[PDB]
Write a structure and sequence with these properties.
The structure is cut from a larger assembly and holds 3 copies of chain A (467 residues).
Chain A (H helix, E strand, L loop, with lengths): L1 E2 L14 E4 L36 H10 L4 E2 L5 H12 L10 E2 L5 H8 L7 E5 L2 E6 L1 H4 L17 E4 L4 H7 L7 E5 L5 E6 H9 L13 E4 L5 H11 L3 E5 L6 H13 L5 E4 L4 H9 L4 E4 L9 H5 L5 H15 L2 E5 L5 H10 L3 E3 L15 E2 L5 E6 L10 H10 L5 E5 L7 H19 L4 H7 L1 E4 L11
Parallel strand pairs in A: 1-19, 3-10, 4-5, 7-8, 10-11, 11-12, 12-13, 13-14, 14-15
Antiparallel strand pairs in A: 2-19, 5-6, 8-9, 16-17, 17-18
The complex binds guanosine-5'-monophosphate (6 copies).
The site of one guanosine-5'-monophosphate has 10 residues of chain C, from helix 1 and strand 4.
């Protein structure tokens, strides 16, 4: 990638150590740039939710797929749950979000705990398939925790049929006391709930769909055990994309797994990682992988940097691997070390065909975890590492292996008190990437890579601007 | 610009990463150097107040214009208010500051809130155009908040006619209980209020005036909409200098706006920004701009560095753009990243024809904002970013554009408990620049640029000295 | 008064040391008892606002007079202000409260400070005598403190003509976003503002009015100086009731003042105090006083107990003086030591024809003081003692008298965060007195005195019940 004159630092650079120099721009507005990825994963935004059990669930899968990004299901997961999640996601409206359906016999405690499963802020009490009420934080508060939800003073909702343009439902919700509105099927059954900002987003983002027009989804497999059988069963389960993940993506087991999956000829794009070296990417590409995950160590839950000293600063690894893959025709997914939208913008600028968010999305409403509360009542969630799920594998043998195994690290990802949903994190990331495109003057991601110029900055250079 | 031998860092440098090496000096004192700018903006000190609605007002405009610096009025402002502000500023005494005029029927609360509008520390109660009393924090305290100001125990004031030299009013205020003194017109009407330190400053600073001897003022326009009509109407409104500001100053819209304004042949100097590249400055100069604003990202209210990764360390961008502009004959205004007078001194040293302060001046008495108080009772003010006012542009369209728009960032700029007025910040900045001139040994700003030698310093190098 | 068998304590009892034993009751509800006073002061509730400059103002006067209680104007007040206040009060609607009238040219700071003058929670912006807008804490917040009130985003109000029954305006305000409603004169000019709870209270309370149907008001004079001339001028000023107040109501100066006022034959009822002895009440009654204030020392602002050791527990003094006055046909006002409605109920039970609240009402919205805020942002107000205004009287003489004079004590009366208005304190007091009537079984205040039975309780007896 192009660098400023005289910029040959004697160290690998991270995201905080680099910056983008704006160039001559012809892109008028942020909406004039398209974020469609070229990697073949079919994501209209360069965002992938990581294959972490704390960040990858059915709700996040459907939400991000509707917003145009693919979601990788966590590895080492019972294929029954995988099939259930895939069937759930593929049966979702391309525009309307699936609400928190509440049976009239549910308790107040269950309703209150479920209200935070989604970012809508309200839950639908539905009887016999017909929506009969709405609950929120207001009517639920004060009443007894174990009273039935049929006696929670159900509020009135704005009902509209499925197929009305986002304009009409938007103006319908201009003065609505409750932001959400129930999209009902023509027969009268509830089909979903659409929000004011959801109506806004329905036009900006184009949902990522497969050849059959269903929300794309992905799943991950390890290398321990029969990789071929697991990958084949995953492909038959309906997963659009297969991701083979391990702590070290340059070992012979990784190459054998990629070779087996490629020989299976499943037709789905191939994703392997992680390698932070050009030779590792070359080996993975020659092994039969179309997409290469890059980054071992920058992950916010990754510990190997402190325990082993291995790793690489994310930006330099991403740019070198992207150069290698583009030399061999392959494509690159940056993984780990993403905490600000500048990280996404720089990862795409370095040459990566896509970026993968990880534990940042764990601090969202839709992450498959428990929304706990701290002492100061600030919302947050616990993010865990994959640990043995990303590692190559009687009571004695189990405990002996577990003694030397890296512990499951835990972190507290705080929720935004106002913009807590993953919708708003995606909005921030996409706005940052669009602004980067406008500053560079690129109409698309390949043009972003081609026309970006990057400079090096010191520690004090990062202090410039408002945090 | 000249650098120390062996100093070729592989990264763009910010203000904290550079230092000035003193050379052989013939300038005896700080008062022996003149800070007159060469850019044609006619500012006798190298200080410009930014085109921010939280830092650019009529009071700051008149104060800084009297002290020798130009003020850029915020963009996207009703031309009626622009004309009112320009007429107010052009009708100000070149020596005497306009006080807080208080009608006798004003309440105690209004008087107390108005007392902090200016740095004088006292407000003038004037009846029928004749000054009849003075109020301050002492007599106002304790009395009922809604009692009339005619019953606030008005104090006695030192009255002097307009035209007395600062020497005489200075010695008149040597033992005065109230620091301020009322300069009255020959007919007896109140013309202004002059302070002890104001008398001191009346000789050190030479006010910036136009060809008609009136306090210079500037105004800003965006690129969205008809730039030519807005610029022409601004020129007819009486603005001395036109500033065309946008988030990205290298886009085609910027060039078209500069071309239109230059074709208008208004005669005022042309200011465009922001570009942090030599090619951007070349394009702006060829587009018909005499002065180029440089710096996108270092701004204390700017967020694009964290959201998009775009930007550049301020010092390297300023020096490169200054070199380019001086190659093409243009002149440079550094913008953003100014928090200490060393930043101003380094910006002028890098080659910029002027520096623009920004949110630092928002924490002053004269900034067009509300002087709020924190829990610890330390005075402070809220500084906001321009956001869409610096960005290129039905309810649906409005909300859709606002969803992706960067939020209006807010910061708390604390007031100096003693030297809170913008007069004292200007004193600090000018003292720092004069000391830099003496250390370099330069009699003027062009000599500052010519004879300055700059070295590179590490993180621990910045720790040297008293903070 | 009747006491329980065997209750002959060897100490004077205060309110905390006594309790009422309920008897056989025929009063069904609290609304079945009338609180009309027999003293001739014409107050329909047994509440009098004290002659304290921190608790007695025009707003409190009109409010309490509309609610059925008389207000004594503070002594040592310029008769011009007395006449202005009396004319203001006598020109008030018997049902509608006078709102915070706001001229369109007032500032935001003035509007915000004025909003807390009344308990309505909203202020009326009126132009040319016609109401044009409403302001509250919501629209006022966030906007600049010195912006004009014509640009404070005036809200819509419910307008009704004067004369509509409280039922109609009550149902009109059932779903109103703003609790208050503007009662307008038939010509369209604004006549007042009536609230939802104000509509509720318009039927429960019967306003205290004179023979001409105007809100009754009272004023106070001291004993120093010509008492006769001051009392006569006060009577001509329109004051319905005259109160002669001093620290010691048994001195010869008190008797001479009462004799002079009685010889004036002004026709208004006579109020003198304070005496806590039967002989003092006898002397005051024989001096030509119809009503006797009792209580010197129990006052929450009174200091003489700690400085001099003089005083008396309020309950025993009140009962003894009431017995003496009823023996001579006079009537009694308890003064001081009122902090809970039980104090009012016990004062009326002891035999006092009325009770006088004092500094408790100083912590209200309508008290003539400044609503200050503490560090924890809890609303409160400063209550001051009368000091020399209740004491018998060159720079040397002034300072010599002031050296030995008791200092003006200050106390912090906290505002109720929800029920801060004096309307709600009056509601609490009246509810307590009505409940006491029901528990005793009395249909009126004379029956309360006749049929009440009081017992003595120890320190631990006061701990019973919820505080
Ligand atoms: N009643 C009800 N429970 C729900 C709904 N959505 C999620 N849940 C709860 O959440 C569980 C799954 O959590 P998830 O893996 O989706 O975060 C379900 O088994 C169920 O207990 C809903 O719409 N209604
Ligand atoms: N070595 C290691 N890497 C992990 C673990 N958990 C997650 N990761 C890596 O870190 C990524 C997420 O980090 P993030 O992008 O949130 O900073 C995952 O996609 C995966 O590549 C773990 O327990 N160990
Ligand atoms: N009465 C009075 N108000 C003033 C004076 N200077 C500023 N103000 C207030 O401040 C407002 C403008 O604030 P600025 O934009 O000057 O910071 C005016 O509309 C007025 O309310 C003055 O001398 N007298
Ligand atoms: N991108 C961006 N730049 C801003 C915004 N507000 C101010 N700026 C820039 O930052 C400068 C002030 O920053 P300062 O000099 O106070 O650090 C302004 O003159 C302008 O160039 C904003 O909202 N967004
Ligand atoms: N503009 C305005 N000021 C009021 C109003 N009511 C009270 N005030 C203010 O309050 C002062 C008197 O306070 P008070 O003695 O009534 O508590 C008045 O002189 C005036 O400053 C009102 O309706 N409008
Ligand atoms: N001795 C004395 N009594 C006072 C003073 N201020 C108020 N009082 C008395 O205390 C009463 C109010 O007390 P409260 O009823 O609020 O406890 C007044 O009506 C008056 O009788 C003062 O400064 N000194």
């Amino acid at each position: 990638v192009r660098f400023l004159d005289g910029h040959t630092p004697a160290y690998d650079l991270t995201y905080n150590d680099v910056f983008v120099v704006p160039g001559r721009s012809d892109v008028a507005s942020r909406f004039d740039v398209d974020l469609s990825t070229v990697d073949g994963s079919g994501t209209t935004i360069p965002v992938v939710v990581a294959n972490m059990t704390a960040v990858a669930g059915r709700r996040m899968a459907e939400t991000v797929a509707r917003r145009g990004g693919i979601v990788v299901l966590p590895q080492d997961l019972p294929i029954t749950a995988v099939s259930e999640t895939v069937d759930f996601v593929k049966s979702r409206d391309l525009v309307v979000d699936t609400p928190v359906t509440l049976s009239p016999e549910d308790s107040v405690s269950d309703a209150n705990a479920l209200l935070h499963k989604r970012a809508h802020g309200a839950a639908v009490v539905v009887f016999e398939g017909r929506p009969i009420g709405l609950v929120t934080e207001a009517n639920c508060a004060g009443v007894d925790r174990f009273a039935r939800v049929r006696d929670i003073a159900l509020s009135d909702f704005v009902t509209a049929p499925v197929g009305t343009d986002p304009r009409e439902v938007f103006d319908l919700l201009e003065h609505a006391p409750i932001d959400v509105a129930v999209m009902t099927a023509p027969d009268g059954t509830l089909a979903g709930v659409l929000t004011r900002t959801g109506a806004i987003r329905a036009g900006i983002y184009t949902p990522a769909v497969d050849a059959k027009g269903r929300l794309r989804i992905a799943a991950a497999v390890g290398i321990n055990g029969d990789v071929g059988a697991k990958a084949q069963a995953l492909a038959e389960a309906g997963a659009d994309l297969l991701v083979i993940d391990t702590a070290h993506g340059h070992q012979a087991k990784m190459l054998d797994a990629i070779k087996a999956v490629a020989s299976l000829d499943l037709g789905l794009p191939l994703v392997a990682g992680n390698v932070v070296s050009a030779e590792g990417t070359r080996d993975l590409i020659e092994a039969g992988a179309s997409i290469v995950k890059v980054g071992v160590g920058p992950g916010a839950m990754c510990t190997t940097r402190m325990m082993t000293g291995v790793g690489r600063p994310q930006f330099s690894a991403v740019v070198e691997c992207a150069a290698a893959a583009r030399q061999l025709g392959g494509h690159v997914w940056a993984d780990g070390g993403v905490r600000h939208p500048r990280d996404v913008a720089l990862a795409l600028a370095a040459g990566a065909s896509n970026v993968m968010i990880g534990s940042w999305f764990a601090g969202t409403y839709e992450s498959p975890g428990d929304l706990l509360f701290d002492r100061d009542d600030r919302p947050y969630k616990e993010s865990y590492g994959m640990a043995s799920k990303r590692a190559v594998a009687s009571s004695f043998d189990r405990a002996r292996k577990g003694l030397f195994e890296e512990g499951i690290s835990t972190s507290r990802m705080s929720l935004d008190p106002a913009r807590g949903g993953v919708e708003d994190l995606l909005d921030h990331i996409t706005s940052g990437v669009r602004s980067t495109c406008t500053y560079v003057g690129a109409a698309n991601l390949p043009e972003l890579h081609e026309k970006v110029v990057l400079g090096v900055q010191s520690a004090a250079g990062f202090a410039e601007g408002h945090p």
